[PDB]
Amino acid sequence: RKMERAEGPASVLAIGTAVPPNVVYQKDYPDFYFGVTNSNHKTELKDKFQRMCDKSCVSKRHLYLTEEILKANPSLCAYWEPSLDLRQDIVVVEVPKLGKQAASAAIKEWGQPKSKITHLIFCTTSGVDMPGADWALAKLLGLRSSVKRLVLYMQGCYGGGTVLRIAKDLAENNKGARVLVVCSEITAITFRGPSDTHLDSLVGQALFGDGASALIVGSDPVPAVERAWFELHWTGSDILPNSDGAIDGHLKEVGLTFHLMKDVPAIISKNIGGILKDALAKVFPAAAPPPPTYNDLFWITHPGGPAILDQVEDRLGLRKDKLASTRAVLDQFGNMSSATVLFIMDEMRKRSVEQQLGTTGEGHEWGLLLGFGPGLTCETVVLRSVPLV
Amino acid sequence: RKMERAEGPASVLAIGTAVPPNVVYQKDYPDFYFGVTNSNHKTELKDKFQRMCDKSCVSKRHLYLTEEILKANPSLCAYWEPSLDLRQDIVVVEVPKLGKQAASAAIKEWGQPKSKITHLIFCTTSGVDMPGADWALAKLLGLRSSVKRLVLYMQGCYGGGTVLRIAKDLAENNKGARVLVVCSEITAITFRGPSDTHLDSLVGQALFGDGASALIVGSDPVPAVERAWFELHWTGSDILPNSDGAIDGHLKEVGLTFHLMKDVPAIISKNIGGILKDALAKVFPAAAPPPPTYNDLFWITHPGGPAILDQVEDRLGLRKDKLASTRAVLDQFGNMSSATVLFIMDEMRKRSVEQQLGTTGEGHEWGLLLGFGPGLTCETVVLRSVPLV
Numbered sequence A, B: 001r002k003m004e005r006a007e008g009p010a011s012v013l014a015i016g017t018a019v020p021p022n023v024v025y026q027k028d029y030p031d032f033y034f035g036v037t038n039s040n041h042k043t044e045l046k047d048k049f050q051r052m053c054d055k056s057c058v059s060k061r062h063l064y065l066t067e068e069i070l071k072a073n074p075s076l077c078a079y080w081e082p083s084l085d086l087r088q089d090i091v092v093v094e095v096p097k098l099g100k101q102a103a104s105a106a107i108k109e110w111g112q113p114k115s116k117i118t119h120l121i122f123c124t125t126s127g128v129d130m131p132g133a134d135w136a137l138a139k140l141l142g143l144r145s146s147v148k149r150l151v152l153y154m155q156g157c158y159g160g161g162t163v164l165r166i167a168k169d170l171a172e173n174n175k176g177a178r179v180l181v182v183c184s185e186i187t188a189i190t191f192r193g194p195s196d197t198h199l200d201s202l203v204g205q206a207l208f209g210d211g212a213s214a215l216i217v218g219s220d221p222v223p224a225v226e227r228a229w230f231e232l233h234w235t236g237s238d239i240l241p242n243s244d245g246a247i248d249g250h251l252k253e254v255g256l257t258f259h260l261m262k263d264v265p266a267i268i269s270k271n272i273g274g275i276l277k278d279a280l281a282k283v284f285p286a287a288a289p290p291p292p293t294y295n296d297l298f299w300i301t302h303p304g305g306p307a308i309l310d311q312v313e314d315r316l317g318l319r320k321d322k323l324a325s326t327r328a329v330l331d332q333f334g335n336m337s338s339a340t341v342l343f344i345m346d347e348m349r350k351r352s353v354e355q356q357l358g359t360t361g362e363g364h365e366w367g368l369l370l371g372f373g374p375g376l377t378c379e380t381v382v383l384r385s386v387p388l389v
């Protein structure tokens, strides 16, 4: 074995998050959005957007785009104007910058020198470039020039599951490997004025927020030195049936465009049960303990929108508190595409410590992280919490 | 271990390649390019381009873009016209299609049913979309809906090393995993008319060709059932010193643009020796056999251009036959970005079988695969050949 492998399960050793400082409260967003977009005359479209914000279960979002920046760049306040080069010029800089802040927080918590990072995974849905956001972050952080990089572009909302699926193999197959995992998303790539012709983009305007999350992932944490918070034990990916074109996203000259052509909440909720039952049967095979019930698992679920959570919770018969951590992040940050599930992982561990629960997963031993995105792709990670004190 | 790991080294079990059927001979390309681009009046620019083709060491290339397609879409025959949406509409379809052909050939050689593919890595520098080229290829091939996908967008010329670096961990860390690896590149994303202002893009017009390559990568090949051709033993990635902005590539509204701002051949050749000496010291540590000499290794080197190969060969003192397989692929296909090193791997194994050499690496046991691209990033894979008969 020319490259020695690790022994234990890939583990989350630290989590950091960062958001743009500018906050927009959802109560204010219909007026802010329709004002800066010169569309207050579209009165029926505006009250349809008000209705979507009222139901969004989003209280606030952090956004790079300010009224000042928008007014300085009127092609972003239009609906279908050529804009991509200006959007790129923003996000190729600011997506790695936001990721740097999250990464620096994770490194600080981890406590080891940054040169012990051996691998980097950078995931984003916001902009593309060569060299990529992985290179830029490595430069911003001053990582070793030999760090093994991977940039995951154009992933979308399942990408938080994807980066864990990859990081698990990198950490487990390389003795001593410490994988910096960063998801960073800035809505300047997709923001546009409203129209009555594509109401998909309206839903995105009510839900999408900005943010970055960063993990240190590694196997065999050094006792009394490093601290594990969650363990990755099983991963799965699925293309849901009858979902072709349920979520499309195209990088056009007018920027990134967002399309919903099927009932995404229905497709996810009708199929998720079979996926989870299958995944749990793999992790807990009869030959042996039976799998925990859904209510005895902890839940880190991508909140694509409230209707996905409501229908999943209804179809699976989840007790109402199971999705609390997930909905708290939706409430305070909106849908941050691939970064969102790592914000929920952070929220859950911090609540568990704060409330002196027995484990980092709200007192439960086993848990599920679920990403949903274009495909329709479902990423399933079965996690183990870590006992607290 | 909820997911059992493999034991042996990740191995290449099959290789397939595909190219567009339309061939352009380099002797004809100056006239073809300047004709279809309405630039024959630019007589001094044209003879500077003739000089670059004369020195390119490229005899022919396969190209999706025909004179017919170019004449039907005049924004591609311009130099700086908005074109991205039309380029995308081409390559989001044709890059996975070309990859399908290569994948089907690799699967056929492998000989197992396609549903035994458990993982897919799709690498391209040509277009981006959601769902991505990985999803489209999975659909085109009819792979299992639970295949674990990964799309590597905007990678560039080092990407053939990157996909091996990732595939090695996927194959080795998952018992029974069979990773379909596809690199597919179509120059419709970057083709543009010539100018006297950016001569970088001229070099690209003399060197870049189209093509896809596909591998099956897996650990523990089934004896007498599967056949290993090369083994992945060690990987490394490096950002070369003083190389910031040596190769940039931006996805703009005019399409993908290509920039060279430093002496790329000089940067690579002055630094490659230290990288190889380091990598070989890791694979063959003293504590023990000394590492093979450069002339006793087989060489799969990304041919970014003839000057890179000439200067690497000169600086390392390689015997003139070491880069023969590499230059044969450059000669017959040009620079196909990330796919090129897998074409060379295919050329080398087929020559070794054809000539009844003792191993799949021209009769040598150990070898080096090198990718170079934006960063300036150098990907190093140390390979082991497989003995023949």
Ligand SMILES: O=C1C[C@@H](c2ccc(O)cc2)Oc2cc(O)cc(O)c21
Binding pocket: A125, A126, A155, A156, A157, A158, A185, A186, A187, A188, A189, A190, A208, A209, A210, A211, A247, A248, A249, A250, A256, A257, A258, A259, A335, A336, A337, A372, A373, A374, B130
């Ligand atoms: O179109 C977008 C925008 C993007 C996004 C969200 C938040 C952000 O801050 C930046 C970009 O997320 C997505 C996620 C998807 O699965 C599919 C998509 O089409 C998109």
Ligand SMILES: O=C1C[C@@H](c2ccc(O)cc2)Oc2cc(O)cc(O)c21
Binding pocket: A130, B125, B126, B155, B156, B157, B158, B185, B186, B187, B188, B189, B190, B208, B209, B210, B211, B247, B248, B249, B250, B256, B257, B258, B259, B335, B336, B337, B372, B373, B374
């Ligand atoms: O700009 C391009 C074009 C691209 C390409 C080559 C062949 C092909 O068929 C399609 C695209 O390769 C590249 C590779 C790089 O490292 C950097 C780059 O900027 C580019």
